[PDB]
Scaffold this active site. Sequence first.
Site, mmCIF file in Angstrom:
data_model
loop_
_atom_site.group_PDB
_atom_site.id
_atom_site.type_symbol
_atom_site.label_atom_id
_atom_site.label_comp_id
_atom_site.label_asym_id
_atom_site.label_seq_id
_atom_site.Cartn_x
_atom_site.Cartn_y
_atom_site.Cartn_z
ATOM 1 N N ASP A 186 10.302 87.766 22.824
ATOM 2 C CA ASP A 186 9.791 89.134 22.942
ATOM 3 C C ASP A 186 8.979 89.330 24.216
ATOM 4 O O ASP A 186 8.792 90.456 24.676
ATOM 5 C CB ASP A 186 8.928 89.498 21.729
ATOM 6 C CG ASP A 186 9.722 89.552 20.439
ATOM 7 O OD1 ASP A 186 10.860 90.066 20.459
ATOM 8 O OD2 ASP A 186 9.206 89.081 19.402
ATOM 9 N N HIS A 223 -1.670 91.716 20.336
ATOM 10 C CA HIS A 223 -1.046 90.464 19.910
ATOM 11 C C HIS A 223 -1.333 89.296 20.846
ATOM 12 O O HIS A 223 -1.237 88.132 20.449
ATOM 13 C CB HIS A 223 0.466 90.642 19.779
ATOM 14 C CG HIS A 223 0.876 91.471 18.605
ATOM 15 N ND1 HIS A 223 0.634 91.083 17.305
ATOM 16 C CD2 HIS A 223 1.516 92.660 18.533
ATOM 17 C CE1 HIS A 223 1.105 92.003 16.482
ATOM 18 N NE2 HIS A 223 1.645 92.969 17.199
ATOM 19 N N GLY A 242 4.470 89.216 21.045
ATOM 20 C CA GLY A 242 4.793 90.546 20.549
ATOM 21 C C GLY A 242 4.693 91.672 21.562
ATOM 22 O O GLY A 242 4.011 92.670 21.315
ATOM 23 N N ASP A 294 -2.182 100.101 13.512
ATOM 24 C CA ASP A 294 -0.804 99.830 13.903
ATOM 25 C C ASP A 294 -0.019 99.280 12.711
ATOM 26 O O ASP A 294 -0.611 98.800 11.745
ATOM 27 C CB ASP A 294 -0.777 98.843 15.072
ATOM 28 C CG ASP A 294 0.601 98.676 15.676
ATOM 29 O OD1 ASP A 294 0.868 99.313 16.716
ATOM 30 O OD2 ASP A 294 1.412 97.903 15.124
ATOM 31 N N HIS A 296 1.838 96.655 12.666
ATOM 32 C CA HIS A 296 1.753 95.199 12.686
ATOM 33 C C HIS A 296 0.299 94.701 12.674
ATOM 34 O O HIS A 296 -0.615 95.399 13.122
ATOM 35 C CB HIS A 296 2.497 94.652 13.911
ATOM 36 C CG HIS A 296 3.943 95.057 13.970
ATOM 37 N ND1 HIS A 296 4.350 96.298 14.411
ATOM 38 C CD2 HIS A 296 5.068 94.390 13.638
ATOM 39 C CE1 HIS A 296 5.665 96.379 14.351
ATOM 40 N NE2 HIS A 296 6.129 95.223 13.881
ATOM 41 N N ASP A 352 3.740 103.291 15.221
ATOM 42 C CA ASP A 352 4.934 102.722 14.598
ATOM 43 C C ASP A 352 4.826 102.764 13.074
ATOM 44 O O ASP A 352 5.605 102.130 12.367
ATOM 45 C CB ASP A 352 5.170 101.286 15.083
ATOM 46 C CG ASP A 352 3.892 100.465 15.144
ATOM 47 O OD1 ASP A 352 2.842 100.950 14.671
ATOM 48 O OD2 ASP A 352 3.937 99.328 15.657
ATOM 49 N N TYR A 393 7.912 103.353 18.674
ATOM 50 C CA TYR A 393 9.157 103.152 19.398
ATOM 51 C C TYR A 393 10.110 104.326 19.200
ATOM 52 O O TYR A 393 11.215 104.351 19.746
ATOM 53 C CB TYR A 393 9.783 101.830 18.966
ATOM 54 C CG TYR A 393 8.776 100.705 19.035
ATOM 55 C CD1 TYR A 393 8.168 100.215 17.885
ATOM 56 C CD2 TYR A 393 8.393 100.165 20.258
ATOM 57 C CE1 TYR A 393 7.231 99.201 17.950
ATOM 58 C CE2 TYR A 393 7.458 99.151 20.331
ATOM 59 C CZ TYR A 393 6.882 98.674 19.175
ATOM 60 O OH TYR A 393 5.951 97.665 19.246
HETATM 61 C C1 TSN Z 1 7.158 92.510 18.410
HETATM 62 C C2 TSN Z 1 7.446 93.724 17.573
HETATM 63 C C3 TSN Z 1 6.440 94.792 17.462
HETATM 64 C C4 TSN Z 1 5.225 94.640 17.970
HETATM 65 C C5 TSN Z 1 4.265 95.750 17.823
HETATM 66 O O1 TSN Z 1 4.657 96.866 17.525
HETATM 67 N N1 TSN Z 1 2.982 95.480 18.039
HETATM 68 O O2 TSN Z 1 2.032 96.495 17.916
HETATM 69 C C6 TSN Z 1 8.603 93.890 16.912
HETATM 70 C C7 TSN Z 1 9.748 92.902 16.919
HETATM 71 C C8 TSN Z 1 9.502 91.765 15.937
HETATM 72 C C9 TSN Z 1 10.949 93.663 16.455
HETATM 73 O O3 TSN Z 1 10.852 94.359 15.459
HETATM 74 C C10 TSN Z 1 12.247 93.584 17.198
HETATM 75 C C11 TSN Z 1 13.341 94.309 16.745
HETATM 76 C C12 TSN Z 1 14.549 94.238 17.427
HETATM 77 C C13 TSN Z 1 14.658 93.439 18.563
HETATM 78 N N2 TSN Z 1 15.837 93.368 19.231
HETATM 79 C C14 TSN Z 1 16.975 94.140 18.757
HETATM 80 C C15 TSN Z 1 15.970 92.544 20.423
HETATM 81 C C16 TSN Z 1 13.555 92.717 19.010
HETATM 82 C C17 TSN Z 1 12.346 92.787 18.329
HETATM 83 K K K Z 2 -2.698 96.906 11.897
HETATM 84 ZN ZN ZN Z 3 3.215 97.515 15.974
#
Ligand code: TSN
Ligand code: K
Ligand code: ZN
Length: 356
Positions: A80, A122, A130, A157, A159, A246, A285
């Site tokens: 990530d 994170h 993250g 958030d 997460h 999110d 997102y």
């Molecule tokens: C790190 C994060 C959110 C962090 C956040 O929001 N911190 O505040 C989300 C990751 C786990 C995730 O969900 C994800 C989904 C699809 C993907 N690919 C399709 C490549 C790659 C990662």
């Molecule tokens: K939180």
């Molecule tokens: Zn988040």
Amino acid sequence: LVPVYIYSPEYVSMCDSLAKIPKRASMVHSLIEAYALHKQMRIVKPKVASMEEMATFHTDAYLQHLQKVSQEGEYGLGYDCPATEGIFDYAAAIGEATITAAQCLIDGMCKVAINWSGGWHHAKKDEASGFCYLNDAVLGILRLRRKFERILYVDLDLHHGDGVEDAFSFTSKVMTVSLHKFSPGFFPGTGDVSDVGLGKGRYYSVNVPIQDGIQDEKYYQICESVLKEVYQAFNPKAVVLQLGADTIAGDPMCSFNMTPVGIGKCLKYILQWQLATLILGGGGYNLANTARCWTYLTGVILGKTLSSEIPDHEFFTAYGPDYVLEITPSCRPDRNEPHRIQQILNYIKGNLKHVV
Ligand SMILES: CC(/C=C/C(=O)NO)=C\[C@@H](C)C(=O)c1ccc(N(C)C)cc1
Ligand SMILES: [K+]
Ligand SMILES: [Zn+2]
Ligand SMILES: [K+]
């Protein structure tokens, strides 16, 4: 009595370049500007980031390598968080932006300062995680720490704010409260209700594990119940508030079922404390919905009621198919059994009894 809004045309342009959230910073500002809210806030340019002000939390070793791979190009620089060009300068810009907002709160320039491009909670001191390479929330807390005896960090958030919690897990002078989704296999995997901190920082970490489908009314009763007890036992002198979007319905995360009005209730309850509050962004997102949320929340801080119709601007077409500011909850279940939720609040109430 006027909120500070961390903004710069160059700054937004840099935040636009972020890999996972293209042009999101502009969409937020453009929409905020479209409601003419910036005309009611003290606009402040973010300072220039130095290696020394990032080093107040992050190790020199990690900062060297992070800047090195940023020039051309372990330390969590994979998955990530892949090493990409200029990622240091982008991460440092936001890190400095949050510190700038923390600085304004110290000078008595305002009671509330806003940096929507921040909230990257994170990042560890020596590890990227993250999408977070630098932890601006921590850096801001450390800056507020110079004037304020007790700092309260509230993470709304989706997460778990593991980075900010881990940074202050051994101290009682900084208390972190995180409402997040918790389920085996869901990032980052930590943040159970049993997580209460370590050392002298025990019982000064609070985590509220929530399941999918929760909506405004239930979320506020949970959030306010905790914040009432926290404010009572901790008596904070300043607040850092992370408002990741999110959690809003329509987000590709498809977890919580929140609307901006729900989060606003939480914000209204914190603002009513009349403390120095640093407002941070974070996740989100669904770029249009994220702009809808933080714009509405900006109005909530300003105490203004915004028009339901989205005004025409640069990103007007991205607000279909209804072109309104409100967001409708998805028609899917709330997976939070009333019993478990009650058990969690009791577990927390007991933990907060230890706070002196
Ligand atoms: C790190 C994060 C959110 C962090 C956040 O929001 N911190 O505040 C989300 C990751 C786990 C995730 O969900 C994800 C989904 C699809 C993907 N690919 C399709 C490549 C790659 C990662
Ligand atoms: K939180
Ligand atoms: Zn988040
Ligand atoms: K703590």
